[PDB]
Amino acid sequence: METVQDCENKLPPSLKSRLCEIRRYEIIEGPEMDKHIHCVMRALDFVYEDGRGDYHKLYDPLNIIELDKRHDVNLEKCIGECVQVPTSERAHVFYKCLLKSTTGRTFKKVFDLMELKKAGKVPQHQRYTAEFVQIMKDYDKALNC
Numbered sequence: 001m002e003t004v005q006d007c008e009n010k011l012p013p014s015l016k017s018r019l020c021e022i023r024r025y026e027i028i029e030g031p032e033m034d035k036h037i038h039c040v041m042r043a044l045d046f047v048y049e050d051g052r053g054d055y056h057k058l059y060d061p062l063n064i065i066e067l068d069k070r071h072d073v074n075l076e077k078c079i080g081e082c083v084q085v086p087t088s089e090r091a092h093v094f095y096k097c098l099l100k101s102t103t104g105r106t107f108k109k110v111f112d113l114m115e116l117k118k119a120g121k122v123p124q125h126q127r128y129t130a131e132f133v134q135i136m137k138d139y140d141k142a143l144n145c
């Protein structure tokens with residue numbers, strides 16, 4: 001039960017400085033970022049221990065928000081990619097691949113929702129509403145973003 005907060009508190013100071021880029025889903029390369037994104041993808045329960053994207057953790061959640069045959073396709077593609085990289089880089093390649101796909105748009109909603117559900121900031125059945133968007137913005141503002 002390590003949280004996304006636990007992971008950010010742990011960042012090394014070259015990245016702590018760039019927290020707001022990170023939390024904007026902006027892509028930063030490196031083995032620093034490789035380890036942090038493994039930490040967060042595990043905290044949000046999106047990847048296996050070795051960093052492989054879990055299809056079944058994302059498929060239904062993505063489709064509930066945006067019903068789209070493309071989630072299947074993008075999940076299969078991005079899981080395929082992450083398997084072919086080393087385990088240090090795997091979760092981060094999965095994450096990066098998804099954000100670049102047409103699934104990115106909905107992935108960020110699912111990611112935001114899970115982050116705040118796990119933080120106990122919104123109820124477990126919370127949907128992606130205008131209120132939620134404001135809750136996320138205020139949450140980031142408290143972190144200086």
Ligand SMILES: NCCc1c[nH]c2ccc(O)cc12
Nearest residue numbers: 004008022023024025040112
């Ligand atoms: N609310 C999304 C925050 C967020 C998006 N991508 C991230 C990557 C790492 C992290 O600690 C946080 C994030």
